[PDB]
Amino acid sequence: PYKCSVCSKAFVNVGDLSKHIIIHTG
Ligand SMILES: [Zn+2]
Numbered sequence: 001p002y003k004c005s006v007c008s009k010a011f012v013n014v015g016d017l018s019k020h021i022i023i024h025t026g
Pocket residue numbers: 004005006007008009020024
């Protein structure tokens with residue numbers, strides 16, 4: 001599951017999510 005738990009969100013997209021995690025960790 002490509003969910004982004006830290007911001008209580010969820011994705012099924014591997015690209016969008018992985019791009020999201022890198023900005024999450026800054
Ligand atoms: Zn997020």
